């Protein structure tokens, strides 16, 4: 709906609880879901484990899912993704703000870094989806509905979807859908993708990079290539000796924030207390300063279902075959569609030239159920959005 093509129409179940304040609002909601998501996730993983995701991707894919949700399934969706925090209830205006949001995000607010996003739907080549549902998906999310033979060729189906994502992620993301997620009973598959590649506004030089000794929790040793640089950066040593460092990209509208808990300190606290407000506070305190950066040259992949975590977060209905409500999707009889499962997969690569991240979130309808430090944040400055985020627990990567 990117002011090229408010005014536009959209019809389905609607729930009730410059105007950029709505977009800025949306960004906050999005950010609120991110920190809360990160926690659960963290709380579920081993402290010394890697974490990497694009909460933004999760947001989108779920907003896309929201398009055909009904009374309560919709409500949860609204509350969980914090949609109900923006001003003016209008369930339908969410998608519009998202449209505007994504707009500014991927469309020509440019050229110093690569910020692309693609979305798509994959329904059964035999069913008849709601035309409006289809049209609003392509209009808001730019999501086209690709017919896939789930009944007769589910495996091939998955594979196809995975190949699409791979195309859309520069090969970075393959495998978003696991080996048995798609079956004969899959009606549709909502998919989002995000791809970033950026150049360091101030880059490290391979000449200063040095390999070195990396110890793990009770585990032996590994080798890490540590980058080095000296320069003026927006830094700040916050409470408890926690460090906060900002590394912008040539595409200065985009930056990478590092949060290092005081050496030997449990990352757990900081994380445990994570709020967008706490974050924003850190930011607001950053001062420019000459310093030496010891940063690793590394890569990290992250994959996982979202079902469990989102369930704990209040997303229950959506997942129940019995109480799920997604009536506005298939033209005839859309009266039995739960989200079997949802998957996420993120890739992160950091080196001397810059950084490169990618992720995918794919919601499947009626399918088959089932080493010390670091915090990363790739954010959109003007837009106040967390694109990517994670924990780097192993720089000597496999």
Q: Within this chain, do residues 250 and 301 fall inside the same structural domain, yes or no? A: no
Q: Within this chain, do residues 300 and 281 fall inside the same structural domain, yes or no? A: no
Strands (E), 275-353: 287-296, 298-305, 339-350
Q: Within this chain, do residues 91 and 138 fall inside the same structural domain, yes or no? A: yes
DSSP state of 217: S
Q: Maximum Cα–Cα distance for the chain, whole Å?
A: 64
Task: Please tell me the experimental approach by which this structure was elucidated.
Answer: X-ray
Q: Within this chain, do residues 28 and 155 fall inside the same structural domain, yes or no? A: yes
Contact criterion met (CB below 8 Å) for 130 and 334: yes
Q: What CATH number does residue 111 fall under?
A: 3.30.497.10
- Domain residues for 381? 200-295+353-395
Of 194, 11, 28, give the one whose Cα is nearest residue 97.
28
Number of domains in the chain: 2
- Which two tokens mark 365? 């309808």
Annotated binding-site residues read 24, 104, 120
Q: 374 CB contacts (<8 Å, ≥6 apart)?
A: 258, 260, 267, 391, 392, 393
Of 59, 40, 41, give the one whose Cα is nearest residue 302.
41
Contact criterion met (CB below 8 Å) for 139 and 8: yes
Burial of 77 (0-12, 13-18, 19+ CB in 10 A): buried
Length in residues, the chain: 398
Q: Within this chain, do residues 335 and 388 fall inside the same structural domain, yes or no? A: no
Residues linked to residue 298 through DSSP beta bridges, in sequence order: 350
Q: What CATH number does residue 385 fall under?
A: 2.30.39.10
Q: Within this chain, do residues 67 and 174 fall inside the same structural domain, yes or no? A: yes
Annotated binding-site residues for heparin read 24, 104, 120
Q: Within this chain, do residues 387 and 241 fall inside the same structural domain, yes or no? A: yes
Q: Within this chain, do residues 16 and 41 fall inside the same structural domain, yes or no? A: yes
Q: Within this chain, do residues 164 and 218 fall inside the same structural domain, yes or no? A: no
Residue 22 φ then ψ, to 5°: -85, -40
CA distance 297 to 186: 41
Q: For 353-371, b where at least 16 C-beta lie within 10 A, e where not — what string?
A: ebbbbbbbbbbbbbbbeeb
Residues linked to residue 294 through DSSP beta bridges, in sequence order: 228
- Which two tokens mark 322? 């019995």
């Amino acid at each position: 709906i990117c002011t090229a093509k408010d005014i536009p129409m959209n019809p389905m179940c609607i729930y009730r609880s410059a105007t950029n304040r709505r977009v800025w609002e949306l960004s906050k909601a999005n950010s609120r879901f991110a920190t809360t998501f990160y926690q659960h996730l963290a709380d579920s993983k081993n402290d010394n484990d890697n974490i990497f995701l694009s909460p933004l991707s999760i947001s989108t894919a779920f907003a896309m899912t929201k398009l055909g949700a009904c009374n309560d399934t919709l409500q949860q969706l609204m509350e969980v993704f914090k949609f109900d925090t923006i001003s003016e209830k209008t369930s339908d205006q969410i998608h519009f703000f998202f449209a505007k949001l994504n707009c500014r995000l991927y469309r020509k607010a440019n050229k110093s870094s690569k910020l692309v996003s693609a979305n798509r739907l994959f329904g059964d080549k035999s069913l008849t989806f709601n035309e409006t549902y289809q049209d609003i998906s392509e209009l808001v999310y730019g999501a086209k509905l690709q017919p896939l033979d789930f009944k007769e060729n589910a495996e091939q189906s998955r594979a196809a979807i995975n190949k699409w994502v791979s195309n859309k992620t520069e090969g970075r993301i393959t495998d978003v859908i696991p080996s048995e997620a798609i079956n004969e009973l899959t009606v549709l598959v909502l998919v989002n993708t995000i791809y970033f590649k950026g150049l360091w506004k101030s880059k490290f030089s391979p000449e200063n990079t040095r390999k070195e000794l990396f110890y793990k929790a009770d585990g032996e040793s590994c080798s890490a290539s540590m980058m080095y640089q000296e320069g003026k950066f927006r830094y700040r040593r916050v409470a408890e000796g926690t460090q906060v460092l900002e590394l912008p990209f040539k595409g200065d509208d985009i930056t990478m924030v590092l949060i290092l808990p005081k050496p030997e300190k449990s990352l757990a606290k900081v994380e445990k207390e994570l709020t967008p407000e706490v974050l924003q506070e850190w930011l607001d305190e950053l001062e420019e300063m000459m310093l030496v950066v010891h940063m690793p040259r590394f890569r990290i992949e992250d994959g996982f279902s979202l079902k469990e975590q989102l369930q704990d977060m209040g997303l229950v209905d959506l997942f129940s075959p019995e109480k799920s409500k997604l009536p506005g999707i298939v033209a005839e009889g859309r009266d039995d569609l739960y989200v079997s499962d949802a998957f996420h997969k993120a890739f992160l690569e950091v080196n001397e030239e810059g950084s490169e991240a990618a992720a995918s979130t794919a919601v499947v309808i009626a399918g088959r159920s089932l080493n010390r430090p670091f915090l990363v944040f790739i954010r959109e400055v003007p837009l106040n959005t967390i694109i990517f985020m994670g924990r780097v627990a192993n720089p000597c990567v496999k």
